Amino acid sequence: GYDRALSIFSPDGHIFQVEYALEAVKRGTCAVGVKGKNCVVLGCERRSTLKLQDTRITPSKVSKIDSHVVLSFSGLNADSRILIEKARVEAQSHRLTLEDPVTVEYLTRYVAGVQQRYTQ
Amino acid sequence: QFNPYGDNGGTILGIAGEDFAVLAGDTRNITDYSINSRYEPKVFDCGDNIVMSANGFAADGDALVKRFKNSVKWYHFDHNDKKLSINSAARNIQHLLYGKRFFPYYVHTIIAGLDEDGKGAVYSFDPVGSYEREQCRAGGAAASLIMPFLDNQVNFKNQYEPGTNGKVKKPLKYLSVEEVIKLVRDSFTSATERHIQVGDGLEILIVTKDGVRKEFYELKRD
Amino acid sequence: TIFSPEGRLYQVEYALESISHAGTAIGIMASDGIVLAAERKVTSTLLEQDTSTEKLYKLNDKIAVAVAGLTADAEILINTARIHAQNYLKTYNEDIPVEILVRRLSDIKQGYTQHGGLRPFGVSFIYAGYDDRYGYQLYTSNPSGNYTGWKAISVGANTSAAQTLLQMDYKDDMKVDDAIELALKTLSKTTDSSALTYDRLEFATIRKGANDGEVYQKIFKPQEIKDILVKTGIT
Amino acid sequence: TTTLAFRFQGGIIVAVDSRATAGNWVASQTVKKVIEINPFLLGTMAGGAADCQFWETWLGSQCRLHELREKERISVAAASKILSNLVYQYKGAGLSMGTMICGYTRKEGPTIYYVDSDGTRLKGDIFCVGSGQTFAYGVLDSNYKWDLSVEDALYLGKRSILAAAHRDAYSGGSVNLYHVTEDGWIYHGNHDVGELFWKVKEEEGSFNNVIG
Amino acid sequence: TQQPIVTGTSVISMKYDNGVIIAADNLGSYGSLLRFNGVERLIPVGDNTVVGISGDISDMQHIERLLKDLVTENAYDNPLADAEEALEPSYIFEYLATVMYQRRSKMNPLWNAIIVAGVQSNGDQFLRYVNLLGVTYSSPTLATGFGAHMANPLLRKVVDRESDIPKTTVQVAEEAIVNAMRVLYYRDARSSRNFSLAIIDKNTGLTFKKNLQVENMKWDFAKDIKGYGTQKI
Amino acid sequence: TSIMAVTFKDGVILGADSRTTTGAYIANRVTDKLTRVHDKIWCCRSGSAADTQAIADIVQYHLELYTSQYGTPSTETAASVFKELCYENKDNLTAGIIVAGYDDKNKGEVYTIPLGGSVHKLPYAIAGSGSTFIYGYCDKNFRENMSKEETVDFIKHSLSQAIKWDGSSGGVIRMVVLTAAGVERLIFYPDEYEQL
Amino acid sequence: NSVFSPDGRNFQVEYAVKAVENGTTSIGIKCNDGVVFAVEKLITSKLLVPQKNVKIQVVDRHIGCVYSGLIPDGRHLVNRGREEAASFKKLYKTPIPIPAFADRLGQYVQAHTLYNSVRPFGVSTIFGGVDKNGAHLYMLEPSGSYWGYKGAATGKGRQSAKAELEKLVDHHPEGLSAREAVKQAAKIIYLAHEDNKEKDFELEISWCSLSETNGLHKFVKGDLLQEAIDFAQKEIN
Amino acid sequence: MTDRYSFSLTTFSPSGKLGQIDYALTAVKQGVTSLGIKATNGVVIATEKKSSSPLAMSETLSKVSLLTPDIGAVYSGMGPDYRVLVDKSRKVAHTSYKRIYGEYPPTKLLVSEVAKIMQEATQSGGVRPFGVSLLIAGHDEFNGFSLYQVDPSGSYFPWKATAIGKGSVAAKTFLEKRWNDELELEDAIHIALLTLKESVEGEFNGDTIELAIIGDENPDLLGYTGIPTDKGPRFRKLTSQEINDRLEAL
Amino acid sequence: MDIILGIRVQDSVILASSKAVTRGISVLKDSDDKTRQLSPHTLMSFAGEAGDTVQFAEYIQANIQLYSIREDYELSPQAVSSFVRQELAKSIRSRRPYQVNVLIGGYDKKKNKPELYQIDYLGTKVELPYGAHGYSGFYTFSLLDHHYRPDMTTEEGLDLLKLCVQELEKRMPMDFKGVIVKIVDKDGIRQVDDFQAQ
Ligand SMILES: Cc1ccccc1CNC(=O)[C@H](CCc1ccccc1)NC(=O)[C@@H](NC(=O)c1ccc(OCc2ccccc2)cc1)[C@@H](C)O
C-alpha cells in the first residue's frame, strides 16, 4: 500500500502539516467551554454561505460520546465524524471490559491518542 | 501413526543445603528394554552458577537445556553482563516451558544453585512450567522410590523424639555436603536395585559460592 | 490529500472546482414530497434520451440521488451505497434511515481526503429520501465528505444564481407541484442554452403516492417532462 | 485441591490447602495456592498448577500496568474480567483452572469473583473451588453467619479446609489463611494438617470417625 | 505423519584406539520383499566422516543430497575449506540432529536412525546417534534396529566401558564388527549377505570397503534336525 | 498392472499390459500405460491413475521447458524431476513410476521410483501388482546386452506370466523400443502370447 | 532506471558502467580445456594481510567468478548465482551448464534495469567453467548483456588488457594451454596495472581445467603462482 | 521489484481539469475514425482498417470485436489498449454475469462493467487512463437494440448514431443530416459506408473497411441444432466480399 | 436443564429466568440474573453453554448501546432481534459457534405493542405469545396453550407464570432455585423482586 511520509520536520523543527491543521481549526466556527460549580457548559456558532437550510436533520456541533460525556469541535466537520465514531466505540469497549463508563480524562487521552497517531 | 515422544528413562535428584546445592542424575540412557548409552550425562552447568537437568524424553530435555543456555547468554548481552539469579532463571524457565503448553516438552526439570543470600536453592518444574522452590526433589523414572526416602531423611518427616511419646518432632537440621552425598549415593543404589531404568553410573554436581564441582560414582550395570 | 499553508485541502478544492462546471442539479423539499431536477451538459440531436440515465439514480425504494460531477466516479459510489442499504435491510429487516446511508457515503468520501494518496471522487450528490423518523429529507454531500440538510439546494454549474432564485421563491408550506414548477423555473434562468427543452432534462419525485399511506418514487419519462414543461408556460 | 473464600461483617476470609498431585502420586504438600496480586488483591488457584500459576502471575502484570496507566488500583470487577476474558480466548484448547479473585476497593468494598476456564465469571459471597469443594461447603455452610467475629471466621475457613483435607484424597498438606479488610490482606499463617488435625480433634471433640 | 516404505536395516559401529568403524548391509527392503540389492547406506563426507543411515531410503536419499551441498556451501568463500575450516564430524552431526528434531517438531519426520562416525581434527574419535525423534546419544558402541539388540551385546564384550577403547586395535574391532554382521544375517529377516564397511583412522583417514560378504557360516547341524517334536525320520 | 523396462545393447524397451480395474470390473481393457514425457524419454505408471497422469503431465511440461532453455535432458534428469514430485508430495500420492530413456552418450537407461519417492538406477525393472509373480522368472532370465529380438521375447514371456496370474493385469502387451534408430511401438495379442 | 533517455539508451545503466570503468582490472582467458581467471588487487596499505582478502569466488564446484566495480554488488550477484546453481542441481540432478548459468545471472542483472525503485549493478562480472561439453568464458555488463568470449577484460586497464588478449588470440589459432594462460594472465594483469599504478598491487589467479583440476574450480597457490609472477616480472624488464 | 507508485497519476489541477483524462482524449482524436448507427432492426459499427505497408495482413487485425454473441465493440485511439479492454470485457461478462445468471448481460450492464474498468485506471495508483474511446453495439430481449460510447474517464452515454476519432466532427454532422428513427438495417449499412468514405485517404474497399452488424439471430452460425430456444448469435462481421457488393451500388 | 421463559400479554412482556448456576455436583449461586438490558425498552434473557452465555449477551448489549448513542434513537425490538439472529446465524458456521439460546422481550413505542422473540443458537427466530428454551418448554408450552389469553393484564400474566414455575418445581429433576421475573412495558424494564417467597 501507500505510506509516503507526509508529516515531517522542517529545518526550524516544525511539522508543517500539523501546523496547517491548526490553521484549518482557526478557520472553523467557534466553540467555547466553561465549567461551573456543579456543571459545564458548551457553546458554538453557525456560519453564513447560505440560509435555506433544514436544521432538524443537520448535525449539531455538540456530540454525545457516552450518556455522561460530550464532545464539541472546531475545524473540518468531516474529520470530526471519524474522531467521534472512534471515541464512541472506545466508550462502549471500556464498559464491556472495565465494567465502568469512561472517565472524562480517559476519553480525552484516547481521542488525543488517535490524533497524535495520525501525525506520525 | 507417528508418535513425537519417547521415554529415555533416567532419574534426577536435587538437594539444597545451607550454602550449597547438589543436582545429581544417573548416566544411563534407555529405549524400552535396551540401553542406548551407559554414560550419557544429563546434568549440565549452564553458567552463572546454575546447574540444570531436564529428565524424561531426552530430545526434549536437550532442546530445553540448549534454550536455557542461550537464554543465559542473551540475558548477559541484553542486561550488561548481570548475573542471572536462580529465582530469575526459574521464572524464565516457566516461560520456556509454557510457550509449549499445547505441544509440551516431555520432561521433569530440576535446577539448582544459590539464592541471592548465598543459601542453597532447588526449583522443580512439571512439563508445562509449574514450579516451586524446595529443599529437595527427585525426578524421572525412580522419583517415586526416592521422594519418600527424602521426606524421611532430609526433612525428618514422621520422626519424633524418643520418650516425648509422640508430642515433639525431631528437630529440622541443615545437612553437610558429606552428609548429602551419602543420601544421594544411597538413594541411587536403592533405585538401581529396584528400577530397571536406573543403573550404570551417577554424576553429582555441587554448587557453592566457589563455582561448580563434579563427582562420578559407578552403579550396577544390569 | 495534503494541507495548504492556509489549511485547505488542495485536491478537495480542485474537485469542487471540477464540479462547478457540471450540469446543474436541484433539490426542493415540500410538505408532501421532494423534487429532483437535473440538466444535461451540452448535448446533441443524436444522443439517445430514451434508454438514457446519467444524473438521477435510485438508491433503494425510499432514496434517490442527483449527480453533479464525473458520471463514472458517481457510479462507483452509487453502487456501494446501494449495497450499504441492502446490508442494513438484511441486518435489521428495516429500510436504512436516510441520514445513515448519507453519513456512510460521506465517510467514504472523507477517506480519500485523509489517507491512501488516491484522488478524491469528483462528485457531489443531492439526496432525496423518506424514512419514518424524519420523513422527507434533502441532503447534500461533496468531495470533502461534508454533508448538510436542505429545504432547497443546488449543485454543479451556477449554484450562486440558482440559490438566489430558490431563496427568493421558496416557502415552507409548498406542495410538490409548486416545487416541480420552481425547479423548472430556476433551471430556466441559471441553462447555458437558448431555451430549456425536454431532452436536456432529468426529473424525479418522491411522493406519498396519492392513496395508500405509502411512498412512491417516480423517475419522469421523456414524455412526462415534455408534459410538465408545457403547463408551466415553457412549452 | 480445596480453596475457599467467603464474605462477612469483618471483610473476607480466604483459605486454601497446599497439596499438589499427579494421578495418585502426591507431588508436594508445601505448595502456594494463593497469589498476592497487590496489597489489596488476592487470587486463588485450583486445577492445572501451570495454567493457574502462569495466567495469574500474568494477571498481576496486567493489574500493575493498569495502575501506571490510570494512577489508581484496579477494581476487583475489572481484574477478574481480565482473567475471565483471556481464558475465554482459549476456550476449547484444554486450559483447566477454577479460581477466585478476592479484594477490597473503596468503590466496591470487599468483593469475591469466581472465575474458571469454562469462561464462567460470578460475583458472590461464598465460594469453594477444587476437588474438595463439597467437603468444605459442608462445614462452611452449616456454620456460616454474617456476624462471625474476625476470630471466628478465620477459624471457620481454617476448619473447612481441614474438613476437605481429611476426606478428599486430593487435598491436604497445610492450611494457608488470609483475611482481607479495608487496610488490605493480612496473612494468618501456615497450618500443617499433621498437627492441626489432632489439636482440633482433641480441642473441639470432633472427628469421632477417627481411630484412637 | 507418514510410513517408511523402502527401508534399509541395522547400521553398526564401534570405536577403537585410533578411530571408529561403521558397517551396514547393502539391502533396501520393501516390506518383506527383499527388493533392492545394491544400496549404499554409508555416506562418506570429506575424509574424516562417515554417516550410516537406516530406515526409509527416500529420506536417506534426501539426507545424502543435504550432506553433499553442505560440503559445497562450506567451500564458498572459504580459503581454508580443505584445512582448518574443513567440515568436522561434530559439525555434520549437530546439523543433522538439528534437522531431525525440527522435522519431528513439525510432525513430519525423516524416518531414519543415523550414526555419525568420524575423527575430529584433534584426533578424537567421534561416534554419535540421532534418530527420527531427534534423540541423540553417544557410546563406545552404537547400533540401530536389530543391531541394537544383537550387535551391541557382542561389541560391548570388546569395549564395555570408555577405558577399553586404548586397548582395542583395528584388527580386533573389525573382526568384532564382521562377526556381528554375520549374526545379524543369521537372525534378521530384513538383512543381507552383502555389506559395506568403513574405517576412519586418525593415522591411516578413510578406508571405505565395498562389497564385503558374510563368510564361515555354520549350517551343517541342520541335517540332524528333523520334525518339531516326536518325528524320528 | 504389469509394467517393465529393460536395457539392452541398442537401447531400452518399455512393456506393459493394457488392463485397468476398479474392483473386479475392467474399466478399460485396451489402456495405454506407456507414457511419453520426451521424444526418447518414456515411463510406466502404476498406483493411482489420477496421480500418475497428473505427475506425467507436469514432468512433460518441465522437460519441454528444459529443452527450450538448456537442449535435451538426460534420462537421469527426467528421473530426478519425477522423484522431486513423488518424494515432496508422498503423503497425497500413490505413484509407482518406471522411467526409461535413450541417450547418445549413456545409451539405454532405467530408473525406478517406488512409493516413497526413492530413485534406483537398474539394468531392468518391474512393477505393478503383476510383478510379484515374475520376480523369480525375470531374475532367472535377464542378461545384460541382449539383442532387440531377445529383449522383446523376455518382456513378452515375463508379462504373459504376470498376466496369467494377476487379475488386475491383462489385455494386449504394449512395447516401446527406444534406440538411436528412433521410437518403435509394438503390440502383442492374447492369441499370440497365451500360447507361450 | 526504468527510464529510457531520448536516444534509446538507459542512463542509470550508463552511469553504472562508469562505476565499473573506475574499478580494478580483472580478466578471463579461455584455453583448450578450461578457463583462467585473474584480478588486480590494489594494496591500500602495508597493513593489508597479504593473500587474505580473496576476490575470486566459486559458484557450485565448477564455476569461477571475478568482477570489477562495486565489490559488494559483485558479492550480491554471486550469492544469487549460488542459489541459482543449487535450485538447478536440486531439480535436475546434474550440475549447472555454464551457458545456463550465464542466462541466470543475465536475467537477474537485467531485472534491475526494469524498475525505477532499483538501481543497476555496479559491476561487470567475468565467469566461466568446464561443463558436460567444454570450457566456456562469459562477461556480463551492468545492463544484463553477456556474451561468450575467447578472452575478456574489464576495469581501469581494460583497453591495454583487451589489446594483449587480441594478440594472444590472433597468434594462437590452435588454442592456448591451461598452464600457459595462467602465466599469460599474470603478464596481462601486470601489463593492466600500468593504467592504475599509483598504488601497489597483489596478483590473484584461479582456473578451471579438465586435465589440470578435473573440471573443478581451484585457486593457483604456491609454486604455480610464483612461477607466473616470475614470468610476468621477466617480461617487463 | 514491487510497485512503488501507489498514488493516483490522474489528479485535479487548479482549474478543475483532470489532465491525464484530457490527454487520453487527445490521443483518441488522432485515432482512426470509427462510427455506430442504430436502425429499427439492427446496429452497425464500422471503422477503417488503416494498414501500415501492404505486407501487413489487415484481416488478422480485429478492430471490430465480438464481446458476447449479441454485443460487439469497435474503437478509436490506442489499439493495444482496446485489445486488453476487449479481453477483460469478455471475461467480466462471464464472471460478473453468465456464471451467476446463466445468460449473457444486457448491453447497458456490460457497458457499465467496461466503464468500471476504465474508471479504475483513472483513479488507481501507478496507472494512466486507457487511451481509447469505444463504441459498443448490442441487443438484449428487454432493451432491444442500443449503441453506447465509453470514454477514458469511464463516462458512457447512449447514441442513436455517432462517430469518434479523427474525422468525428465532420461525420457527426453527416449523420445528423441522414439519421431518422425509421431506418432499416441495410439503410444504416449504406449510410455508414457513406460516412466512412469522407474520413479515408487511400483505397476504399472491403479489405480496408471493417464493418459489423447486430441484427437477427443466425442459426447457421451457432454450430449445433436441436434446442429450438436459441437461434444463434445476433453479431455478424460482414465479409470483405459483402462490403464490396454494397459499394458498387453506392 | 436452565429455565428461560417468556410470556407476552397485552400491554407488556414478562421474562422469567432461573437463578441457579450449577457446575458439576455443586450449586454455586442461587441468585444469578440471566438477563441483560439492551435498551430502555428491550430486554434479553439467555441460557446455554457456561462461558458463551454472558460473553454473547454483553457483546450484543455493547453493540445496541453503541447504536443508541450513535443515532440518539432506540432500535425497535424487531430490529434488535434481527441483529441478534444474524449474529447467531454467522456464528453457527464459524470455527467455534456460540452455544446460546435467547428470548428477546421488548415494547415497541412506535407501534405501542409488546413483542417476544425466541431465538436458538442456530439463529432460528420466531415471534410468539409465549416461549421457552430447554427442557422447561416440554411442560410450559401445553400449560400456556390452555390457560393463556391474548388480552390479559400484566397482573394476569404474573399468575400464568406462577403456574408455570409451580409446574416446573413439581416435575423437573433439577433444583433451579426459583426465578427472577422482569416486566418490559411502555414505561421500560422493572424487576418484580419478590416472586419466590410470594
Ligand atoms: C491449581 C494449583 C496451583 C499450584 C499448585 C498446585 C495446584 C493444584 N493442582 C494440582 O495439583 C494438579 C492436579 C492434577 C491436574 C492437572 C491438570 C489439570 C487438572 C488437574 N497437578 C498438576 O498440575 C501437576 N502437573 C500435572 O498433573 C501434569 C502437567 C503436565 C503434564 O504433561 C503431560 C504431557 C506431556 C507431553 C504431551 C502430552 C502430555 C503431566 C502432568 C503439577 C503439580 O506437577
Tab-separated table of C-alpha atoms in Angstrom, chain E:
chain	number	residue	atom	x	y	z
E	1	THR	CA	2.779	-38.255	9.640
E	2	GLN	CA	3.937	-40.936	7.195
E	3	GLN	CA	5.164	-44.517	6.932
E	4	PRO	CA	8.561	-45.915	5.927
E	5	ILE	CA	8.299	-47.648	2.534
E	6	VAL	CA	11.606	-48.805	1.064
E	7	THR	CA	13.796	-49.403	4.112
E	8	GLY	CA	17.333	-50.301	4.953
E	9	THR	CA	18.049	-52.473	8.386
E	10	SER	CA	20.799	-52.128	11.058
E	11	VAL	CA	23.790	-49.830	10.952
E	12	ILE	CA	26.527	-50.909	13.410
E	13	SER	CA	29.552	-49.067	14.804
E	14	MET	CA	32.238	-49.036	17.494
E	15	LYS	CA	35.355	-47.082	18.313
E	16	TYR	CA	38.847	-48.489	18.829
E	17	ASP	CA	42.224	-46.987	19.878
E	18	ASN	CA	42.825	-44.847	16.748
E	19	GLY	CA	39.400	-44.408	15.206
E	20	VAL	CA	35.893	-45.620	14.510
E	21	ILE	CA	34.423	-48.435	12.413
E	22	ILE	CA	30.987	-48.339	10.846
E	23	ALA	CA	29.207	-51.034	8.834
E	24	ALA	CA	25.803	-51.501	7.120
E	25	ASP	CA	24.406	-54.036	4.643
E	26	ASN	CA	23.504	-53.277	1.031
E	27	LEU	CA	19.788	-54.165	1.124
E	28	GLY	CA	16.742	-51.980	0.548
E	29	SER	CA	13.631	-53.890	1.655
E	30	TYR	CA	10.050	-53.251	0.609
E	31	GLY	CA	8.104	-54.780	3.472
E	32	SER	CA	9.159	-58.433	3.352
E	33	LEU	CA	10.188	-58.274	-0.306
E	34	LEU	CA	13.989	-58.081	-0.436
E	35	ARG	CA	13.623	-55.687	-3.340
E	36	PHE	CA	16.897	-53.831	-3.969
E	37	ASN	CA	20.392	-55.247	-3.514
E	38	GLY	CA	22.941	-52.538	-4.367
E	39	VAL	CA	22.090	-49.845	-1.812
E	40	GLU	CA	24.976	-47.966	-0.223
E	41	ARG	CA	23.908	-46.805	3.245
E	42	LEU	CA	27.279	-45.466	4.384
E	43	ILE	CA	27.794	-41.857	3.331
E	44	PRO	CA	31.373	-40.503	3.449
E	45	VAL	CA	31.651	-36.733	3.946
E	46	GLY	CA	35.128	-35.358	3.323
E	47	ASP	CA	37.786	-37.785	4.513
E	48	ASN	CA	37.028	-37.653	8.227
E	49	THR	CA	33.319	-38.554	8.494
E	50	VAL	CA	31.052	-41.422	7.510
E	51	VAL	CA	27.298	-41.242	8.030
E	52	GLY	CA	25.433	-44.550	8.279
E	53	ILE	CA	21.692	-44.386	7.733
E	54	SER	CA	18.906	-46.891	8.459
E	55	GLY	CA	15.164	-46.569	7.905
E	56	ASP	CA	13.339	-45.019	4.977
E	57	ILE	CA	15.537	-44.957	1.870
E	58	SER	CA	13.869	-41.963	0.199
E	59	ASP	CA	14.636	-39.975	3.341
E	60	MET	CA	18.212	-41.353	3.244
E	61	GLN	CA	18.485	-40.029	-0.356
E	62	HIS	CA	17.279	-36.646	0.848
E	63	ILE	CA	19.891	-36.667	3.640
E	64	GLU	CA	22.586	-37.671	1.094
E	65	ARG	CA	21.758	-34.621	-1.004
E	66	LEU	CA	21.796	-32.353	2.081
E	67	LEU	CA	25.256	-33.546	3.085
E	68	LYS	CA	26.684	-33.005	-0.409
E	69	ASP	CA	25.593	-29.407	-0.664
E	70	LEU	CA	26.632	-28.842	2.927
E	71	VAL	CA	30.158	-29.607	1.590
E	72	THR	CA	29.629	-27.234	-1.381
E	73	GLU	CA	28.360	-24.438	0.884
E	74	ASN	CA	31.285	-24.847	3.289
E	75	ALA	CA	33.755	-24.309	0.440
E	76	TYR	CA	32.081	-20.981	-0.505
E	77	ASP	CA	34.391	-18.025	0.266
E	78	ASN	CA	36.426	-20.480	2.341
E	79	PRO	CA	40.138	-20.401	1.565
E	80	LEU	CA	40.723	-22.845	4.438
E	81	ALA	CA	37.996	-25.262	3.245
E	82	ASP	CA	40.435	-28.176	2.998
E	83	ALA	CA	42.367	-27.364	6.200
E	84	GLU	CA	41.282	-25.631	9.449
E	85	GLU	CA	37.750	-24.823	8.269
E	86	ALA	CA	37.064	-28.309	6.894
E	87	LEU	CA	33.800	-29.906	7.964
E	88	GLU	CA	34.125	-31.758	11.250
E	89	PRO	CA	32.264	-34.903	12.295
E	90	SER	CA	30.811	-32.848	15.176
E	91	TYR	CA	29.508	-30.147	12.785
E	92	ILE	CA	27.900	-32.728	10.493
E	93	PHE	CA	26.171	-34.410	13.436
E	94	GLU	CA	24.866	-31.237	15.049
E	95	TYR	CA	23.459	-30.160	11.696
E	96	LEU	CA	21.564	-33.441	11.220
E	97	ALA	CA	20.444	-33.528	14.879
E	98	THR	CA	19.033	-30.016	14.407
E	99	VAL	CA	17.197	-31.100	11.234
E	100	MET	CA	15.836	-34.324	12.705
E	101	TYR	CA	14.442	-32.571	15.775
E	102	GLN	CA	12.895	-29.727	13.741
E	103	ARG	CA	11.295	-32.282	11.417
E	104	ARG	CA	9.745	-34.197	14.315
E	105	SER	CA	8.590	-30.944	15.903
E	106	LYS	CA	6.753	-30.191	12.665
E	107	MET	CA	5.193	-33.667	12.816
E	108	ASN	CA	6.890	-34.599	9.505
E	109	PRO	CA	9.944	-36.698	10.382
E	110	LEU	CA	12.790	-38.158	8.365
E	111	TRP	CA	12.009	-41.790	9.128
E	112	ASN	CA	15.617	-42.737	9.899
E	113	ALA	CA	18.152	-43.695	12.501
E	114	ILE	CA	21.615	-42.247	11.880
E	115	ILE	CA	25.091	-42.911	13.266
E	116	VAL	CA	27.810	-40.353	12.610
E	117	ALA	CA	31.248	-41.905	12.835
E	118	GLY	CA	34.411	-39.878	12.403
E	119	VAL	CA	37.707	-38.493	13.659
E	120	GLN	CA	37.963	-34.883	14.906
E	121	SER	CA	40.856	-32.748	13.597
E	122	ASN	CA	42.408	-33.020	17.088
E	123	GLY	CA	42.444	-36.835	16.743
E	124	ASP	CA	39.380	-37.586	18.937
E	125	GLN	CA	37.041	-40.397	17.883
E	126	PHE	CA	33.536	-39.209	17.085
E	127	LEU	CA	30.567	-41.587	17.416
E	128	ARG	CA	27.018	-40.362	17.905
E	129	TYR	CA	23.433	-41.450	17.118
E	130	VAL	CA	20.392	-39.387	16.200
E	131	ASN	CA	17.024	-40.696	15.058
E	132	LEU	CA	13.578	-39.600	13.753
E	133	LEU	CA	12.532	-38.202	17.159
E	134	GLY	CA	15.684	-36.126	17.418
E	135	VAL	CA	17.007	-38.243	20.292
E	136	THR	CA	20.797	-38.252	20.436
E	137	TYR	CA	23.263	-40.337	22.403
E	138	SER	CA	26.870	-41.460	22.362
E	139	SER	CA	28.536	-44.706	23.470
E	140	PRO	CA	31.707	-46.742	22.734
E	141	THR	CA	29.460	-48.925	20.558
E	142	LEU	CA	26.279	-47.845	18.741
E	143	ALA	CA	23.761	-49.732	16.636
E	144	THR	CA	20.291	-49.216	15.178
E	145	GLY	CA	17.391	-51.647	14.593
E	146	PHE	CA	18.350	-55.308	15.175
E	147	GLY	CA	21.956	-54.227	15.637
E	148	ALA	CA	20.882	-52.612	18.901
E	149	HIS	CA	19.571	-55.934	20.202
E	150	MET	CA	22.149	-58.345	18.777
E	151	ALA	CA	25.284	-56.454	17.766
E	152	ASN	CA	25.664	-54.239	20.866
E	153	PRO	CA	25.862	-57.245	23.200
E	154	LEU	CA	28.717	-58.676	21.083
E	155	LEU	CA	30.571	-55.392	20.534
E	156	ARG	CA	30.332	-54.419	24.229
E	157	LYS	CA	32.158	-57.650	25.099
E	158	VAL	CA	35.168	-55.968	23.431
E	159	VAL	CA	34.512	-52.403	24.647
E	160	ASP	CA	32.367	-52.443	27.807
E	161	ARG	CA	33.453	-49.010	29.084
E	162	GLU	CA	35.463	-45.937	27.973
E	163	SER	CA	38.851	-47.231	29.183
E	164	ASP	CA	38.626	-50.261	26.840
E	165	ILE	CA	38.874	-48.028	23.727
E	166	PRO	CA	43.011	-47.571	24.031
E	167	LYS	CA	43.148	-51.393	24.394
E	168	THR	CA	41.176	-52.170	21.182
E	169	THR	CA	43.022	-52.441	17.859
E	170	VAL	CA	41.691	-52.044	14.293
E	171	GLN	CA	42.022	-55.817	13.763
E	172	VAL	CA	40.102	-56.858	16.875
E	173	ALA	CA	37.403	-54.219	16.209
E	174	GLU	CA	36.948	-55.013	12.505
E	175	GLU	CA	36.701	-58.682	13.436
E	176	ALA	CA	34.038	-57.962	16.071
E	177	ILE	CA	32.130	-55.884	13.529
E	178	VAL	CA	32.403	-58.532	10.791
E	179	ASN	CA	31.249	-61.250	13.219
E	180	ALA	CA	28.279	-59.109	14.319
E	181	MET	CA	27.256	-58.682	10.658
E	182	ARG	CA	27.178	-62.491	10.400
E	183	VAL	CA	24.931	-62.893	13.433
E	184	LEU	CA	22.608	-60.187	12.050
E	185	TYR	CA	22.418	-62.148	8.782
E	186	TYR	CA	21.525	-65.262	10.764
E	187	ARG	CA	18.659	-63.747	12.759
E	188	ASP	CA	17.441	-60.595	10.989
E	189	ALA	CA	14.890	-61.471	8.296
E	190	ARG	CA	15.415	-57.947	6.833
E	191	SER	CA	19.189	-58.379	6.449
E	192	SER	CA	21.526	-59.226	3.583
E	193	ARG	CA	24.757	-61.123	2.915
E	194	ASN	CA	26.471	-58.177	1.185
E	195	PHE	CA	27.660	-55.181	3.163
E	196	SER	CA	29.864	-52.121	3.135
E	197	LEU	CA	32.225	-51.166	5.971
E	198	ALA	CA	34.233	-48.018	6.603
E	199	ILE	CA	37.148	-47.401	8.947
E	200	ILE	CA	38.099	-43.845	9.852
E	201	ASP	CA	41.565	-43.824	11.435
E	202	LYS	CA	43.458	-40.801	12.799
E	203	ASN	CA	46.611	-42.037	11.030
E	204	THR	CA	45.781	-44.266	8.016
E	205	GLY	CA	41.964	-41.489	7.238
E	206	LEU	CA	39.015	-43.081	5.472
E	207	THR	CA	39.283	-46.658	4.260
E	208	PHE	CA	35.991	-47.447	2.505
E	209	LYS	CA	35.442	-51.179	1.879
E	210	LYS	CA	32.665	-52.081	-0.586
E	211	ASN	CA	31.124	-55.470	-1.456
E	212	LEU	CA	32.056	-57.433	1.663
E	213	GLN	CA	30.364	-60.827	2.169
E	214	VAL	CA	29.496	-62.902	5.214
E	215	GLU	CA	31.826	-65.930	5.231
E	216	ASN	CA	32.369	-69.007	7.510
E	217	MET	CA	28.708	-69.790	8.131
E	218	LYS	CA	27.552	-72.788	10.144
E	219	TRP	CA	24.649	-74.705	8.605
E	220	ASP	CA	25.730	-78.339	8.829
E	221	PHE	CA	23.963	-79.188	12.127
E	222	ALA	CA	20.706	-78.556	10.200
E	223	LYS	CA	20.848	-82.056	8.693
E	224	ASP	CA	20.370	-83.900	12.002
E	225	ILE	CA	17.299	-81.819	12.904
E	226	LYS	CA	14.024	-83.478	11.900
E	227	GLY	CA	10.395	-82.903	12.955
E	228	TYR	CA	9.089	-80.434	15.532
E	229	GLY	CA	8.982	-82.843	18.492
E	230	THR	CA	8.445	-86.590	18.141
E	231	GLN	CA	9.216	-87.254	14.459
E	232	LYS	CA	12.204	-89.578	14.013
E	233	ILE	CA	12.815	-89.746	10.244
